[PDB]
Amino acid sequence: MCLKLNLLDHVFANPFMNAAGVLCSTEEDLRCMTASSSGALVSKSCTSAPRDGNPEPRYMAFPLGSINSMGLPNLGFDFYLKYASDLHDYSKKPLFLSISGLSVEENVAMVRRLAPVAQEKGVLLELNLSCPNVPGKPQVAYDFEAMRTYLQQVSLAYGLPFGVKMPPYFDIAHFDTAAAVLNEFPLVKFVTCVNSVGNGLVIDAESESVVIKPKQGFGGLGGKYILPTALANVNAFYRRCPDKLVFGCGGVYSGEDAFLHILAGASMVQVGTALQEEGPGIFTRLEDELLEIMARKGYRTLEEFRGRVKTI
Amino acid sequence: MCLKLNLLDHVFANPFMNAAGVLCSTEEDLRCMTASSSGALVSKSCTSAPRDGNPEPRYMAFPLGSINSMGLPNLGFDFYLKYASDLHDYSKKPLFLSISGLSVEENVAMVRRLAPVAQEKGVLLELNLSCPNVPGKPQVAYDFEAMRTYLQQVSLAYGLPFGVKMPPYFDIAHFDTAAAVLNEFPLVKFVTCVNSVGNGLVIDAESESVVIKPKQGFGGLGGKYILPTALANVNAFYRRCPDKLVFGCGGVYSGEDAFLHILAGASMVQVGTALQEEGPGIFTRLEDELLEIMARKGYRTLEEFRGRVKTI
Ligand SMILES: Cc1cc2nc3c(=O)[nH]c(=O)nc-3n(C[C@H](O)[C@H](O)[C@H](O)COP(=O)(O)O)c2cc1C
Numbered sequence: 001m002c003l004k005l006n007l008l009d010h011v012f013a014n015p016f017m018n019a020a021g022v023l024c025s026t027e028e029d030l031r032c033m034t035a036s037s038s039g040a041l042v043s044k045s046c047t048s049a050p051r052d053g054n055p056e057p058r059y060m061a062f063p064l065g066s067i068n069s070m071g072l073p074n075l076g077f078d079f080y081l082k083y084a085s086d087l088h089d090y091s092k093k094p095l096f097l098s099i100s101g102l103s104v105e106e107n108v109a110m111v112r113r114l115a116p117v118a119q120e121k122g123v124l125l126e127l128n129l130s131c132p133n134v135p136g137k138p139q140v141a142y143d144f145e146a147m148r149t150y151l152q153q154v155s156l157a158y159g160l161p162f163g164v165k166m167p168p169y170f171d172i173a174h175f176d177t178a179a180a181v182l183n184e185f186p187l188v189k190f191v192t193c194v195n196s197v198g199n200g201l202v203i204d205a206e207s208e209s210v211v212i213k214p215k216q217g218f219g220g221l222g223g224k225y226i227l228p229t230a231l232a233n234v235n236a237f238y239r240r241c242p243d244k245l246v247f248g249c250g251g252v253y254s255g256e257d258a259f260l261h262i263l264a265g266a267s268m269v270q271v272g273t274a275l276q277e278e279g280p281g282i283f284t285r286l287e288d289e290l291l292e293i294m295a296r297k298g299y300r301t302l303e304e305f306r307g308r309v310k311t312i
Numbered sequence: 313m314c315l316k317l318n319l320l321d322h323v324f325a326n327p328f329m330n331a332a333g334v335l336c337s338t339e340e341d342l343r344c345m346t347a348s349s350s351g352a353l354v355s356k357s358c359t360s361a362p363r364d365g366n367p368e369p370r371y372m373a374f375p376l377g378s379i380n381s382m383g384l385p386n387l388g389f390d391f392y393l394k395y396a397s398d399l400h401d402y403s404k405k406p407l408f409l410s411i412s413g414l415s416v417e418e419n420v421a422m423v424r425r426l427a428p429v430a431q432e433k434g435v436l437l438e439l440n441l442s443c444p445n446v447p448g449k450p451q452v453a454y455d456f457e458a459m460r461t462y463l464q465q466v467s468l469a470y471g472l473p474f475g476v477k478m479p480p481y482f483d484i485a486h487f488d489t490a491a492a493v494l495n496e497f498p499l500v501k502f503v504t505c506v507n508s509v510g511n512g513l514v515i516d517a518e519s520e521s522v523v524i525k526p527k528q529g530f531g532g533l534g535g536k537y538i539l540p541t542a543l544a545n546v547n548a549f550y551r552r553c554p555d556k557l558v559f560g561c562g563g564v565y566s567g568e569d570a571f572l573h574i575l576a577g578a579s580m581v582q583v584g585t586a587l588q589e590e591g592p593g594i595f596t597r598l599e600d601e602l603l604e605i606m607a608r609k610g611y612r613t614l615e616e617f618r619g620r621v622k623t624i
Pocket residue numbers: 019020021022044045059066068070072098100128165194195196221222223224226249250251252270271272273274276
């Protein structure tokens with residue numbers, strides 16, 4: 001019985017990693033994720049220049065999940081590139097580097113500089129097309145023409161395999177169109193489903209107030225709220241992109257949740273809200289719990305059940 | 313202290329009603345809703361001809377909410393129109409009739425016949441632009457040009473005030489556009505936010521199977537999953553449609569949840585999943601609980617806190 005995977009020309013001890021944005025902004029964070037039992041890690045989505053992000057309070061967690069409007073606070077692309085070039089211990093686990101430039105030009109600028117490091121070190125690009133928290137910037141992948149432009153420009157400028165972080169969709173027509181756009185791009189080797197469910201609103205009944213400051217309280221939702229949404233998107237893209245990998249993200253708190261993501265089609269499984277709340281000790285627990293479910297079912301490897309969800 | 317209110321030239325004993333689709337398909341259901349302590353009722357979304365709907369199982373409930381792909385099973389518009397014209401006791405409470413034709417032409421045909429009954433009896437139209445469960449028919453209100461066409465043609469054919477059942481949105485640009493489309497039509501006096509969060513997927517770990525049969529298990533989500541999304545949409549439309557009413561729907565299980573919807577801007581509060589699971593006794597409990605929160609806070613009227621959610 002084993003959780004090992006071999007994909008994108010890298011070997012992973014198990015399918016778990018942080019979700020971008022959680023425990024991955026500073027060198028301290030990345031060293032922590034590296035020391036954890038996770039199979040991989042991804043750095044904070046970055047911009048060309050450092051950013052302070054949105055005003056605080058900008059994250060709050062509750063029993064059923066979290067809301068945030070961080071606003072892409074990050075140490076800047078130079079930092080994450082240097083981390084990937086000089087600092088990361090690749091003998092420990094593979095590293096993904098997430099970028100979220102505020103325009104196609106900014107993304108293109110960054111990937112031109114990332115390319116030689118990706119060639120040399122094997123760092124893997126996750127292009128974030130789904131940030132719902134920057135005031136005035138709608139989610140790129142909710143505009144299919146813009147999505148195509150970004151992917152055309154990034155494919156041309158980068159020229160290496162990469163992946164895309166996708167927003168959740170809620171309409172079969174959108175699954176069909178989105179997956180078809182992705183299928184136009186052979187360098188897109190993995191699709192991460194999903195980013196936060198955008199622009200939710202938590203209100204505290206006692207204070208009669210929204211709980212985060214940016215955007216009049218409107219922020220991305222994660223955690224228990226989003227699991228069925230996340231599984232639907234994982235499965236929709238798994239079915240529609242048979243020549244790509246799908247990484248699952250959304251609502252994972254237990255090895256059972258990870259098991260459902262894998263049944264739905266997930267290769268790697270990312271942990272956001274639960275990791276933010278529990279800390280990196282979560283990775284040993286999710287590993288044990290997934291192996292227990294596999295043991296009980298007689299599954300010896302992940303491939304034995306990946307994408308094997310039954311329909312009626 | 314009582315929760316009585318006036319809206320749309322009708323008087324309501326309290327802001328509570330069923331959500332369309334729940335406990336409202338047959339004469340028996342409608343008689344049951346009428347005998348309940350709800351302030352109003354709405355009939356099942358209907359089509360010109362009766363429909364058997366999607367294959368069973370097609371509804372499932374869980375601690376955090378529900379998933380369904382009913383597929384508009386209904387007794388046909390002739391039945392709901394007859395209920396409105398001949399059978400409903402308007403001395404008990406107001407009635408909303410929901411229609412969900414599968415084309416603009418179908419909706420136009422229905423509203424032309426509804427008009428004389430609305431003139432005589434005061435039945436209120438809720439035009440459903442957000443059914444996410446009929447195979448091959450995308451949610452109308454996710455296509456803004458289609459949404460405009462439907463509202464143009466219905467406004468012209470019907471000529472009387474009406475309301476619209478909206479899908480949830482997740483992008484500030486979409487809130488802006490959707491509300492601007494709605495604001496083009498002075499006959500649209502109310503906006504119901506929200507219909508189900510479309511096309512989620514629930515998977516049972518033990519059986520390794522989806523839990524509903526239609527559309528490979530993909531169905532609309534309601535219940536605790538969707539409360540922050542519901543509140544966001546209620547508030548977004550409340551802010552952008554100052555000259556219309558917003559009815560809140562999504563995630564109501566308690567007087568506290570109703571209190572939050574009303575703080576976000578809700579005039580009426582609809583109850584779907586919780587009503588499906590608890591039954592019509594829920595309305596007395598919700599009234600008691602809302603009155604208790606109001607008393608504790610020193611509020612004597614709904615108008616005192618409606619839309620008064622505080623930002624930071
Ligand atoms: C604190 C916070 C910051 C995040 N920052 C990013 C980000 O930088 N890039 C990104 O793609 N997603 C970001 N996310 C979204 C997560 O990666 C993930 O998609 C989302 O939280 C859903 O997963 P969950 O249900 O496990 O939380 C962030 C989420 C939160 C909670």
